[PDB]
Amino acid sequence: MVLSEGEWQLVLHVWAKVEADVAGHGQDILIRLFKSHPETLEKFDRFKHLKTEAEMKASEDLKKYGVTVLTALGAILKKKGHHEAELKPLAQSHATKHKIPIKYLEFISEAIIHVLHSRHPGNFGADAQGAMNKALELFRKDIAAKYKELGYQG
Numbered sequence: 153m154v155l156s157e158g159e160w161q162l163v164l165h166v167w168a169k170v171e172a173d174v175a176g177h178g179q180d181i182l183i184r185l186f187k188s189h190p191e192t193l194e195k196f197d198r199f200k201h202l203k204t205e206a207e208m209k210a211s212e213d214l215k216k217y218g219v220t221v222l223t224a225l226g227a228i229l230k231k232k233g234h235h236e237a238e239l240k241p242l243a244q245s246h247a248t249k250h251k252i253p254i255k256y257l258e259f260i261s262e263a264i265i266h267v268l269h270s271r272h273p274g275n276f277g278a279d280a281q282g283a284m285n286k287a288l289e290l291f292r293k294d295i296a297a298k299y300k301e302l303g304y305q306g
């Protein structure tokens with residue numbers, strides 16, 4: 153797939169708002185993911201024992217990971233599709249060490265779109281949400297193709 157420059161503009165305009173508070177957005181997104189799809193919390197040995205949202209909110213480890221995820225994804229989005237280098241080490245670790253099925257990447261993509269819609273309604277109208285969705289589909293598609301080269305396709 154290929155996004156037009158106007159679609160990348162929409163994606164990078166709302167991402168610039170997320171970047172004013174990377175740790176807060178990271179928390180919201182992961183909590184939305186774990187509340188919606190609790191099976192995903194099991195991949196985290198660091199904090200799969202968390203039982204409630206309150207515990208999740210108070211976890212410093214969870215907030216750190218949120219920053220890790222959003223910083224890596226922000227660097228990929230800013231490439232505007234030229235992200236081959238960035239995707240290599242990510243696809244290897246998620247396919248061979250963590251073992252994250254593509255389906256889980258779809259789940260976190262939904263959680264991102266939900267939180268942007270909640271926090272940034274004025275910069276996340278239908279067109280900007282369609283463009284973010286396209287940017288995340290592109291990301292999943294390219295990661296899925298690398299999983300396959302790596303021997304995992306999950």
Ligand code: HEM
Nearest residue numbers: 192195196198220221224225241242245250252256257260
């Ligand atoms: C937007 C999508 C995602 C991005 C950009 C991302 C990025 C990262 C980065 C940069 C790391 C640390 C370096 C490395 O291990 O490669 C990491 C580690 C990890 N990721 Fe993610 N990730 C994403 C989705 C997921 C999902 C959906 C799951 C699980 C349901 C997952 C589970 C893990 C695990 C278990 C670790 C190890 C954490 C540790 O113990 O510190 N990732 N991820």
